Design a protein around this ligand. Structure first.
Ligand code: MOO
Length: 131
């Protein structure tokens, strides 16, 4: 299963919002300008695909979601991926989809530590993967 990451785990330094966005944008070939835009759940779904290909129902992800009920659908896809891979993290979905900075920044700081603990260096085509 996945390597879990806890508050007590030894991890890299937290990233600035600028450096976190750079990671997201460069890794996934996106152009987010705000951490709040992670409220859509789609980037997290793709990072899960990148970590564990086949863990996520990529075809069901709404990459161009603009409505909160769509953000929730994307996070349920992510939650199913976490369950499949034995990730013991509860996603505060109700908070994230509202677009508030602190909630979204807190979760992406954890998720980047999770990612770094699990990523194997595989090549990945995030554009080809969004079809
Ligand atoms: O000054 Mo920050 O580390 O982007 O919240």
């Amino acid at each position: 299963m996945a390597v879990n990451v806890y508050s007590t785990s030894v991890t890299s330094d937290n990233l600035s919002r600028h450096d976190m966005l750079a990671w997201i944008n460069e890794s996934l070939q996106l152009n987010l300008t705000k951490i709040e835009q992670l409220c859509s759940g789609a980037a997290y779904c793709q990072f899960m695909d990148m970590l564990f290909p086949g863990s996520i129902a990529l075809k069901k992800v709404k990459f161009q979601a603009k409505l909160e009920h769509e953000y929730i659908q994307n996070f349920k896809i992510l939650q199913a991926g976490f369950k499949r891979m034995g990730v013991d993290k509860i996603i505060p979905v109700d908070k994230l989809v509202k677009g508030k900075f602190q909630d979204n920044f807190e979760f992406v700081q954890w998720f980047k530590k999770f990612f770094d603990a699990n990523y194997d260096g595989k090549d990945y085509d995030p554009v080809a993967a969004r079809q």
